[PDB]
Ligand binder design. Structure first.
Ligand SMILES: *[C@@H]1O[C@H](CO)[C@@H](O[C@@H]2O[C@H](CO)[C@@H](O[C@@H]3O[C@H](CO[C@H]4O[C@H](CO)[C@@H](O)[C@H](O)[C@@H]4O)[C@@H](O)[C@H](O[C@H]4O[C@H](CO[C@H]5O[C@H](CO)[C@@H](O)[C@H](O)[C@@H]5O)[C@@H](O)[C@H](O)[C@@H]4O[C@H]4O[C@H](CO)[C@@H](O)[C@H](O)[C@@H]4O)[C@@H]3O)[C@H](O)[C@H]2NC(C)=O)[C@H](O)[C@H]1NC(C)=O
Ligand SMILES: O[C@@H]1[C@@H](O)[C@H](O[C@@H]2CO[C@H](O)[C@H](O)[C@H]2O)OC[C@H]1O
Length: 319
C-alpha cells in the first residue's frame, strides 16, 4: 500500500522521512508525513541538534524536538534522533570557547547526558557522532578532535549508552556508501569504539547521492554487507538524489533507477533495518540552497505530486 508497508513486507523495520518544525504548520504536508503506508519513521532535521537543544551552556531547550516526537507518537511512527556530537550547527559558546581537554569533555558529556536522558525511551536510534571523517578517511579537525583527540568518539558513545542503554547507537556519515578511503575509515570507527569497550550498534549511511552518479546496486550492497559483517546494523539515513537542473523526463527516469538501486541494496542486506529520505517533497529539500544548480532530489515534487522515483522506490522494495 506504500513505501513503509512495502519495506516491512521485506523485513525492514521502516521506510521513513526527515521533517522540520516550520513545515508542521503546512496541513497537506503533515497529512502525507502522517501517512503510515509511506512513512513508519521520522527524523527531526534540525530540532535535536546541539544549537537547538543547548543554545547556552547548561540551558536546555526541548520544545521543538518534543513536537516532532509527539507527532511520531500520535501517528505510530518510530523516531531516529539526530544528532549529539557534530562540528556543524554548534552554538557560539562551543565554537568560541577557550577550552582544555577537561572542560570541553565535561561540556560534551553534559550535553549528551542531558539530551539522551530527556529522550530516553523515545528514540529507536541516536546519531551519536556525525561526520567525524575527512573525505580521505582521516579524522575531521573539529573542535572536539583538536582538543580531546580520537577518544571523543568512543567517550561520546559510552556517555550515550550510560544515559539510555536501550536505544541503538549509530555513527552517521556521508560518502561511506561506496568503497573508498572514507568507507574504510568508517569501518575502522566501528572497530575503534569496540576496542575502547564502548557500544556501537549501527552505521548510518547518509546517501546524499547525485542523479547519474549514484553507486550501483551491487557496489551499495557490497558496502552494506562490509558493515553488517562487523556485527552492526545499517540504515540509509538521509537519502536524496540531487539532479543537475533543469529537470527533464530523462533525468527523472535516471533518478527513479538510482533510487530503485538504493532500496534494493537495503532489501538484499540482512541487517539493513530501513531507509529514511531527507524530507519527501522537493518543496522543502535542503539541496537547492547548498548545491549550486542542483535540485529536485526527492520522490514527490514541490506540489506534493509523486515523481517517477516513487515508483522506482516501490520497485526496489519489491512491491
Ligand atoms: C583527553 O582526556 C581523555 C580522558 O582522560 C583522554 O582519553 C584517553 O585517550 C586515549 C587516546 O588518546 C585513550 O587511549 C586509547 O585507549 C584504547 C583503549 O585501551 C584500553 O583497552 C585496550 C584493549 O583492551 C588495551 O589494549 C589498552 O592497554 C587499554 O586498556 C586503545 O584502544 C587505544 O589504542 C590505540 O591508540 C594507541 C595510541 O596511539 C597513538 O600513539 C601511538 C604510539 O605512540 C601512535 O602510533 C598512534 O598513531 C597514536 O598517535 C595505539 O598505541 C594503539 O595501538 C591503538 O592504535 C590503533 O587505534 C587507533 C584508533 O584508536 C588508530 O588511530 C591506530 O592507527 C591504531 O589502529 C588508545 O590507547 C584512553 O583510553 C583515553 N582515556 C580515557 C580515560 O578515556 C585523551 O587522551 C585526552 N586528550 C588529550 C589531547 O590530551
Ligand atoms: O535544514 C537543513 C538540514 O536539512 C541539514 O541537514 C544536515 C545535512 O548535512 C548533514 O548531512 C547532516 O547530517 C544533516 O543534519 O542541515 C542544515 C539545515 O539548514
Amino acid at each position: 500500500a506504500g513505501l513503509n508497508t512495502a519495506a516491512k513486507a521485506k523485513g525492514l523495520k521502516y521506510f521513513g522521512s526527515a521533517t522540520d518544525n516550520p513545515e508542521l504548520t503546512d496541513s497537506a504536508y503533515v497529512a502525507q508525513l502522517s501517512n503510515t503506508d509511506d512513512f513508519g519513521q521520522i527524523t527531526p532535521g534540525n530540532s535535536m541538534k546541539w544549537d537547538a537543544t543547548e543554545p547556552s551552556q547548561n540551558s536546555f531547550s526541548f520544545a521543538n524536538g518534543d513536537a516532532v516526537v509527539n507527532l511520531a507518537n500520535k501517528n505510530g511512527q518510530l523516531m531516529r534522533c539526530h544528532t549529539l556530537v557534530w562540528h556543524s550547527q554548534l552554538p557560539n559558546w562551543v565554537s568560541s570557547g577557550s577550552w582544555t581537554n577537561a572542560t570541553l569533555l565535561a561540556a560534551m558529556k553534559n550535553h549528551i547526558t542531558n539530551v539522551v536522558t530527556h529522550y530516553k525511551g523515545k528514540c529507536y536510534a541516536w546519531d551519536v557522532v556525525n561526520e567525524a571523517l575527512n573525505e580521505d578517511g582521516t579524522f575531521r579537525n573539529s573542535v572536539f578532535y583538536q582538543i580531546i583527540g580520537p577518544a571523543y568518539i568512543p567517550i561520546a558513545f559510552a556517555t550515550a549508552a550510560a544515559a539510555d542503554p536501550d536505544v541503538k547507537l549509530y555513527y552517521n556519515d556521508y560518502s561511506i556508501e561506496y568503497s573508498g578511503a572514507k568507507a574504510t575509515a568508517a569501518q575502522n570507527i566501528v572497530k575503534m569504539i569496540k576496542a575502547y569497550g564502548a557500544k556501537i550498534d549501527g552505521v548510518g549511511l547518509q546517501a546524499h547521492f547525485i542523479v547519474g552518479s549514484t553507486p550501483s546496486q551491487s557496489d551499495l550492497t557490497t558496502v552494506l554487507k562490509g558493515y553488517t559483517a562487523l556485527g552492526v546494523e545499517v540504515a540509509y539515513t538521509e537519502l536524496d538524489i540531487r539532479m543537475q537542473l533543469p529537470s527533464t523526463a530523462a533525468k527523472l527516469a535516471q533518478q527513479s533507477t538510482d533510487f530503485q538501486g538504493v532500496a534494493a541494496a537495503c532489501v538484499s542486506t540482512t541487517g539493513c533495518v530501513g531507509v529514511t529520505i531527507w524530507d519527501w517533497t522537493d518543496k522543502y529539500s535542503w539541496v537547492p540552497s547548498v548545491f549550486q544548480g542542483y535540485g529536485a532530489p526527492l520522490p514527490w515534487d514541490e506540489n506534493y505530486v509523486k515523481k517517477p522515483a516513487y515508483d522506482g522506490l516501490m520497485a526496489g522494495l519489491g512491491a
